[PDB]
Design a protein around this motif. Structure first.
Motif, PDB file in Angstrom:
ATOM      1  N   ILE A   4      -3.638  -3.348  -6.962  1.00  0.00           N
ATOM      2  CA  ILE A   4      -3.054  -2.018  -6.830  1.00  0.00           C
ATOM      3  C   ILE A   4      -4.003  -1.167  -6.001  1.00  0.00           C
ATOM      4  CG2 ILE A   4      -2.180   0.004  -8.047  1.00  0.00           C
ATOM      5  CD1 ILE A   4      -1.626  -1.729 -10.442  1.00  0.00           C
ATOM      6  N   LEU A   5      -3.470  -0.508  -4.973  1.00  0.00           N
ATOM      7  CA  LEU A   5      -4.290   0.325  -4.100  1.00  0.00           C
ATOM      8  C   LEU A   5      -4.600   1.633  -4.819  1.00  0.00           C
ATOM      9  CD1 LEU A   5      -5.703   0.453  -1.450  1.00  0.00           C
ATOM     10  CD2 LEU A   5      -3.639   1.397  -0.399  1.00  0.00           C
ATOM     11  N   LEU A   6      -5.848   1.787  -5.266  1.00  0.00           N
ATOM     12  CA  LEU A   6      -6.235   2.990  -5.995  1.00  0.00           C
ATOM     13  C   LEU A   6      -6.367   4.180  -5.053  1.00  0.00           C
ATOM     14  CD1 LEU A   6      -8.887   1.495  -8.460  1.00  0.00           C
ATOM     15  CD2 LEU A   6      -6.397   1.652  -8.697  1.00  0.00           C
ATOM     16  N   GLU A   7      -7.261   4.079  -4.075  1.00  0.00           N
ATOM     17  CA  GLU A   7      -7.379   5.156  -3.104  1.00  0.00           C
ATOM     18  C   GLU A   7      -6.680   4.772  -1.807  1.00  0.00           C
ATOM     19  OE1 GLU A   7     -11.386   6.286  -2.206  1.00  0.00           O
ATOM     20  OE2 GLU A   7     -11.061   8.398  -2.704  1.00  0.00           O
ATOM     21  N   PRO A   8      -5.997   5.709  -1.149  1.00  0.00           N
ATOM     22  CA  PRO A   8      -5.314   5.378   0.112  1.00  0.00           C
ATOM     23  C   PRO A   8      -6.320   5.114   1.223  1.00  0.00           C
ATOM     24  CG  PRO A   8      -5.168   7.728  -0.330  1.00  0.00           C
ATOM     25  CD  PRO A   8      -5.755   7.102  -1.564  1.00  0.00           C
ATOM     26  N   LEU A   9      -6.319   3.887   1.735  1.00  0.00           N
ATOM     27  CA  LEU A   9      -7.199   3.482   2.821  1.00  0.00           C
ATOM     28  C   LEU A   9      -6.392   3.241   4.091  1.00  0.00           C
ATOM     29  CD1 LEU A   9     -10.142   3.534   2.548  1.00  0.00           C
ATOM     30  CD2 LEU A   9      -9.243   2.798   0.329  1.00  0.00           C
ATOM     31  N   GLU A  10      -7.117   3.026   5.186  1.00  0.00           N
ATOM     32  CA  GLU A  10      -6.500   2.892   6.496  1.00  0.00           C
ATOM     33  C   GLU A  10      -5.960   1.483   6.703  1.00  0.00           C
ATOM     34  OE1 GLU A  10      -9.566   3.842   5.896  1.00  0.00           O
ATOM     35  OE2 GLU A  10      -9.535   6.005   6.265  1.00  0.00           O
ATOM     36  N   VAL A  18       1.174  -1.987  -4.222  1.00  0.00           N
ATOM     37  CA  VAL A  18       0.648  -3.312  -4.527  1.00  0.00           C
ATOM     38  C   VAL A  18       0.438  -4.071  -3.224  1.00  0.00           C
ATOM     39  CG1 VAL A  18       0.958  -5.368  -5.936  1.00  0.00           C
ATOM     40  CG2 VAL A  18       1.980  -3.195  -6.653  1.00  0.00           C
ATOM     41  N   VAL A  19      -0.774  -4.581  -3.024  1.00  0.00           N
ATOM     42  CA  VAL A  19      -1.128  -5.307  -1.810  1.00  0.00           C
ATOM     43  C   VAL A  19      -1.929  -6.544  -2.191  1.00  0.00           C
ATOM     44  CG1 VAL A  19      -0.996  -3.431  -0.134  1.00  0.00           C
ATOM     45  CG2 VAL A  19      -3.039  -3.678  -1.553  1.00  0.00           C
ATOM     46  N   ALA A  36     -10.230  -0.674  -6.056  1.00  0.00           N
ATOM     47  CA  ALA A  36      -9.068  -1.529  -6.259  1.00  0.00           C
ATOM     48  C   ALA A  36      -9.206  -2.262  -7.584  1.00  0.00           C
ATOM     49  CB  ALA A  36      -8.898  -2.529  -5.111  1.00  0.00           C
ATOM     50  N   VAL A  37      -8.060  -2.631  -8.155  1.00  0.00           N
ATOM     51  CA  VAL A  37      -7.988  -3.414  -9.383  1.00  0.00           C
ATOM     52  C   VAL A  37      -6.859  -4.423  -9.226  1.00  0.00           C
ATOM     53  CG1 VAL A  37      -7.403  -3.387 -11.835  1.00  0.00           C
ATOM     54  CG2 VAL A  37      -8.987  -1.684 -10.924  1.00  0.00           C
ATOM     55  N   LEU A  38      -7.130  -5.683  -9.559  1.00  0.00           N
ATOM     56  CA  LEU A  38      -6.133  -6.729  -9.390  1.00  0.00           C
ATOM     57  C   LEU A  38      -4.952  -6.519 -10.332  1.00  0.00           C
ATOM     58  CD1 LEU A  38      -7.554  -8.032 -12.006  1.00  0.00           C
ATOM     59  CD2 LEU A  38      -8.669  -9.548 -10.356  1.00  0.00           C
ATOM     60  N   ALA A  39      -3.776  -6.951  -9.880  1.00  0.00           N
ATOM     61  CA  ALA A  39      -2.531  -6.748 -10.614  1.00  0.00           C
ATOM     62  C   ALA A  39      -2.384  -7.836 -11.670  1.00  0.00           C
ATOM     63  CB  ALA A  39      -1.342  -6.746  -9.658  1.00  0.00           C
ATOM     64  N   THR A  40      -2.431  -7.438 -12.936  1.00  0.00           N
ATOM     65  CA  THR A  40      -2.243  -8.320 -14.075  1.00  0.00           C
ATOM     66  C   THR A  40      -0.863  -8.073 -14.683  1.00  0.00           C
ATOM     67  OG1 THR A  40      -3.137  -6.880 -15.813  1.00  0.00           O
ATOM     68  CG2 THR A  40      -4.712  -8.042 -14.414  1.00  0.00           C
ATOM     69  N   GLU A  41      -0.600  -8.724 -15.815  1.00  0.00           N
ATOM     70  CA  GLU A  41       0.617  -8.451 -16.566  1.00  0.00           C
ATOM     71  C   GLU A  41       0.524  -7.154 -17.359  1.00  0.00           C
ATOM     72  OE1 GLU A  41       1.976 -11.951 -18.692  1.00  0.00           O
ATOM     73  OE2 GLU A  41       0.437 -13.167 -17.703  1.00  0.00           O
ATOM     74  N   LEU A  44       0.695  -3.814 -14.900  1.00  0.00           N
ATOM     75  CA  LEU A  44       2.083  -3.565 -14.530  1.00  0.00           C
ATOM     76  C   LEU A  44       2.764  -2.684 -15.567  1.00  0.00           C
ATOM     77  CD1 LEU A  44       1.960  -5.512 -12.094  1.00  0.00           C
ATOM     78  CD2 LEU A  44       4.086  -6.535 -12.943  1.00  0.00           C
ATOM     79  N   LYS A  45       2.452  -2.899 -16.848  1.00  0.00           N
ATOM     80  CA  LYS A  45       2.941  -2.007 -17.894  1.00  0.00           C
ATOM     81  C   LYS A  45       2.284  -0.637 -17.804  1.00  0.00           C
ATOM     82  CE  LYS A  45       2.864  -6.192 -20.733  1.00  0.00           C
ATOM     83  NZ  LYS A  45       2.259  -6.825 -21.938  1.00  0.00           N
ATOM     84  N   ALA A  46       1.024  -0.585 -17.364  1.00  0.00           N
ATOM     85  CA  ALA A  46       0.336   0.693 -17.214  1.00  0.00           C
ATOM     86  C   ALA A  46       0.770   1.431 -15.955  1.00  0.00           C
ATOM     87  CB  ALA A  46      -1.179   0.476 -17.200  1.00  0.00           C
ATOM     88  N   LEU A  47       1.103   0.701 -14.890  1.00  0.00           N
ATOM     89  CA  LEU A  47       1.586   1.337 -13.669  1.00  0.00           C
ATOM     90  C   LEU A  47       3.030   1.799 -13.829  1.00  0.00           C
ATOM     91  CD1 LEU A  47       2.114   1.729 -10.474  1.00  0.00           C
ATOM     92  CD2 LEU A  47      -0.223   1.864 -11.348  1.00  0.00           C
ATOM     93  N   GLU A  48       3.885   0.949 -14.406  1.00  0.00           N
ATOM     94  CA  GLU A  48       5.204   1.407 -14.831  1.00  0.00           C
ATOM     95  C   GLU A  48       5.092   2.550 -15.828  1.00  0.00           C
ATOM     96  OE1 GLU A  48       7.695  -1.629 -16.375  1.00  0.00           O
ATOM     97  OE2 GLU A  48       7.798  -2.799 -14.519  1.00  0.00           O
ATOM     98  N   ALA A  49       4.010   2.580 -16.607  1.00  0.00           N
ATOM     99  CA  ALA A  49       3.854   3.600 -17.636  1.00  0.00           C
ATOM    100  C   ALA A  49       3.464   4.947 -17.042  1.00  0.00           C
ATOM    101  CB  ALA A  49       2.816   3.150 -18.656  1.00  0.00           C
TER     102      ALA A  49
END
Ligand code: MG
Ligand code: MG
Ligand code: MG
Ligand code: MG
Ligand code: MG
Ligand code: MG
Ligand code: MG
Ligand code: MG
Ligand code: MG
Ligand code: MG
Ligand code: MG
Length: 73
Positions: A4-10, A18-19, A36-41, A44-49
């Motif tokens: 998940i892209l935490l800070e917007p980079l170039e 998600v990248v 950045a933090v890798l996308a886990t299961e 995804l609940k926290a990002l949807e949250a």
RNA sequence: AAGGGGACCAGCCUAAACCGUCCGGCUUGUCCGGGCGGGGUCGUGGGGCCCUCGGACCGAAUCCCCAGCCUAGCCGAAG
């Protein structure tokens, strides 16, 4: 690896987008800096949250403004 | 090696679906993660959620007692 892209980079994308990038680049560059933090299961609940929490605030705000709109005029 | 014939038997606890409890992370939450309890342990698959009807006898591998046992012995016929 997906992250998940935490800070917007170039030349990468949007904040929160998600990248998937080469894992070593994130293990040596992105994650140790907290960018950045890798996308886990779970995140995804926290990002949807948090998206659905901004939507739980938005759906309250705009609907209250529309009820007050029905009050005025 | 299968199998047959004998010796002997005994089947179980968890991870996780689910709920609850506290914790602490800040990113403020129907959030995550980490603890503990409960819930659960299957193969003619089985459980979790939702509802429908139905609602004592088994039994330890743990514990206690009792028979029994070994670490000394004792009686024991008649020139
Ligand atoms: Mg690029
Ligand atoms: Mg710093
Ligand atoms: Mg407006
Ligand atoms: Mg006006
Ligand atoms: Mg073989
Ligand atoms: Mg055999
Ligand atoms: Mg036991
Ligand atoms: Mg007897
Ligand atoms: Mg005997
Ligand atoms: Mg004795
Ligand atoms: Mg005599």
């Amino acid at each position: 690896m997906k992250v998940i892209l935490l800070e917007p980079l170039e030349n990468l994308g949007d904040v929160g987008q998600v990248v998937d990038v080469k894992p070593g680049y994130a293990r040596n560059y992105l994650l140790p800096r907290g960018l950045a933090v890798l996308a886990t299961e779970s995140n995804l609940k926290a990002l949807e949250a948090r998206i659905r929490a901004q939507a739980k605030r938005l759906a309250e705000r705009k609907a209250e403004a529309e009820r007050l709109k029905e009050i005025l005029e």
